[PDB]
Write a protein that binds this DNA or RNA. Structure first.
Ligand SMILES: [Ca+2]
Length: 78
DNA sequence: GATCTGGCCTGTCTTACACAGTGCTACAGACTGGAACAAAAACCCTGCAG
């Protein structure tokens, strides 16, 4: 399987689709491969009704808050 | 010692006050796949405009 292998064999196996995404992203988005594979990951996770992992991902990619503002904290407290 | 009466009893009537909050669970409410749609957003592109 692809998930247990090292990065050498993973990239060796996937280089075809890696350069496919490379050329398609330089075609459409103008030098943005990272956001292209991000939108691909989001669509592949939402098609399977696993919205939770997509929400965690979006909370990692410039996520609003690791920690909370003291205000809403006091709110929850009371 | 009757008489009448101020006042007291009792019965009834009216407005008030604690009865949350806690686990279970079912339901409706939200999310998607192809087809296909219309309706606007904003540049570009042209005209009819002086
Ligand atoms: Ca009351």
């Amino acid at each position: 399987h692809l998930l247990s292998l090292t990065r050498r064999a993973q990239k060796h196996r996937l280089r075809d689709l890696k350069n496919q995404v490379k050329t398609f992203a330089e075609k459409e988005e103008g030098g943005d491969v990272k956001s292209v594979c991000l939108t691909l990951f989001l669509l592949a996770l939402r098609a399977g009704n696993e919205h939770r992992q997509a929400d965690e991902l979006e909370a990692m990619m410039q996520g609003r808050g690791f920690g909370l503002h003291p205000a809403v904290c006091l709110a929850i407290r009371v």
